[PDB]
Short mmCIF file of C-alpha atoms in Angstrom, two decimals:
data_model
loop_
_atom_site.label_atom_id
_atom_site.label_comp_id
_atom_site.label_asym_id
_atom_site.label_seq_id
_atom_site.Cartn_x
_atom_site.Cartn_y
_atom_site.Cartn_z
CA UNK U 10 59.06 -40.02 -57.97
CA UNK U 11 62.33 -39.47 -56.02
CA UNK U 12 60.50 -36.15 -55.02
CA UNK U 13 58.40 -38.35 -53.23
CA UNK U 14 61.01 -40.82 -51.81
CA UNK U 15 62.56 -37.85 -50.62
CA UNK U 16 58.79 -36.42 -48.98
CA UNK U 17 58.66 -39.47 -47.04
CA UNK U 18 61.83 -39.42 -45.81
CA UNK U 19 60.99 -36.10 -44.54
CA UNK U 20 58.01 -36.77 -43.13
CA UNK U 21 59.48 -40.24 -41.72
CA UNK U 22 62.33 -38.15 -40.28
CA UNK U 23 59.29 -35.72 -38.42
CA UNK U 24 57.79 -38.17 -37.01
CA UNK U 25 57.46 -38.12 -33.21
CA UNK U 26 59.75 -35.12 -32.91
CA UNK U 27 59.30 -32.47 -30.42
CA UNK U 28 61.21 -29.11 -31.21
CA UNK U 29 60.20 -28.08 -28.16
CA UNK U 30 62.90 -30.46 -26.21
CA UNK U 31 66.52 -30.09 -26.94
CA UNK U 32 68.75 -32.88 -28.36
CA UNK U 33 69.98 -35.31 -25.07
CA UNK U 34 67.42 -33.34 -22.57
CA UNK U 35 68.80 -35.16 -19.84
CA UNK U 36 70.72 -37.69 -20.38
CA UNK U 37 73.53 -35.47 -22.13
CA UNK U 38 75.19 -31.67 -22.94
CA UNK U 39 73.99 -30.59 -26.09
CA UNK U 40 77.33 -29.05 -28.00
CA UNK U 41 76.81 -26.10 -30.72
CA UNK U 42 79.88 -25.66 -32.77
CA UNK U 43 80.27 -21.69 -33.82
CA UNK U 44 81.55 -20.02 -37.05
CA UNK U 45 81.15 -16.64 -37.85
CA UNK U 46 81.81 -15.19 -41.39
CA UNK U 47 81.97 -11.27 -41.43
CA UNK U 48 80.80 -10.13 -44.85
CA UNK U 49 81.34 -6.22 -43.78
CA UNK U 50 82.16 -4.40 -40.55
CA UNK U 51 80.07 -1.66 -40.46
CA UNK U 52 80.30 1.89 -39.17
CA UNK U 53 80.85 2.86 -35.95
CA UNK U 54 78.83 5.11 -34.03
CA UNK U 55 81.29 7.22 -31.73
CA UNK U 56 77.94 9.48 -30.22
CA UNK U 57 75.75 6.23 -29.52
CA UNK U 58 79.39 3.90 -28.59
CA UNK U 59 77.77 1.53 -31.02
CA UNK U 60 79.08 -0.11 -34.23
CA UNK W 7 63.91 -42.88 -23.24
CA UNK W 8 64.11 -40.23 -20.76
CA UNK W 9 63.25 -37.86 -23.58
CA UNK W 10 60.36 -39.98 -24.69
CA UNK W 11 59.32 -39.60 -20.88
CA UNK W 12 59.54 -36.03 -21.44
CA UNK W 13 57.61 -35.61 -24.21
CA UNK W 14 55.06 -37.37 -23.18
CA UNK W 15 54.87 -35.70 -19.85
CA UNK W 16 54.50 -32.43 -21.76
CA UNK W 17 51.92 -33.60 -24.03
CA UNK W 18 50.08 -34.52 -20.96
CA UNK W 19 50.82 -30.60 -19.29
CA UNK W 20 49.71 -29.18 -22.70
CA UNK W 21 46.30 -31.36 -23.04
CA UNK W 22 43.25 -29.78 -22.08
CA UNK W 23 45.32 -26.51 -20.80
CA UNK W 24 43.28 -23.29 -21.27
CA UNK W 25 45.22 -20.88 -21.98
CA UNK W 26 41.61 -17.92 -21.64
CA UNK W 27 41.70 -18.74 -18.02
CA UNK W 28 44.32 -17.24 -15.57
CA UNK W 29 45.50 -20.19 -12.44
CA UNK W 30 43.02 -20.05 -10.01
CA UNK W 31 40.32 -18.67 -12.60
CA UNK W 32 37.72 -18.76 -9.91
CA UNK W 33 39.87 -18.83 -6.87
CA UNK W 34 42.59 -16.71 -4.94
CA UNK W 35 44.52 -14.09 -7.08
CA UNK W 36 47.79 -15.85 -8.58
CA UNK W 37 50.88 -14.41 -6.95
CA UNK W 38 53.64 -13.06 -9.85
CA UNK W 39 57.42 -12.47 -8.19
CA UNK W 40 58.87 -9.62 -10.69
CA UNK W 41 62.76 -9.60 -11.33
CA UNK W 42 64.66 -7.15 -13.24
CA UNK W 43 68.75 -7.36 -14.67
CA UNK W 44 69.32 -4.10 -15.78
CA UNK W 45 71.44 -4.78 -19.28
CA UNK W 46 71.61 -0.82 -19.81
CA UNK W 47 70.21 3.16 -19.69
CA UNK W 48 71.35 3.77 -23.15
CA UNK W 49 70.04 7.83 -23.89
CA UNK W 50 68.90 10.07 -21.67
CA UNK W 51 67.20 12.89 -24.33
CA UNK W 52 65.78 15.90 -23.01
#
């Protein structure tokens, strides 16, 4: 059953949440740390100024 | 929590909120203020 533990940890963790607020609404700065991984650079579009 | 307070003062907006009926359903006509930032005119064809 550690399917199950694990299902009730989820739906323990679930609980009471509300996606719609943001993480410290306001009582703090919410900080998103940023990676980007370029798999290909595609072409570029000289007519449209695009790529 | 001021969070908690939050959610729960959404949860209050949200209950019992039709969303068929317009503000003012029977009333004066609601009032909409229209603003535009104009990102791009990308291609003019003719």
């Amino acid at each position: 059953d550690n399917t199950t533990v694990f299902t009730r940890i989820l739906d323990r963790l679930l609980d009471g949440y509300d996606n719609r607020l943001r993480p410290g609404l306001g009582e703090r700065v919410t900080e998103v740390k940023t990676d980007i991984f370029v798999t290909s650079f595609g072409p570029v579009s000289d007519h449209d100024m695009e790529y | 929590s001021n969070m908690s307070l939050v959610k729960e003062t959404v949860d209050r907006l949200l209950k019992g909120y039709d969303i068929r009926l317009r503000p003012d359903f029977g009333g004066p006509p609601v009032a909409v203020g229209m603003n535009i930032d104009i990102a791009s005119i990308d291609m003019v064809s003719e």
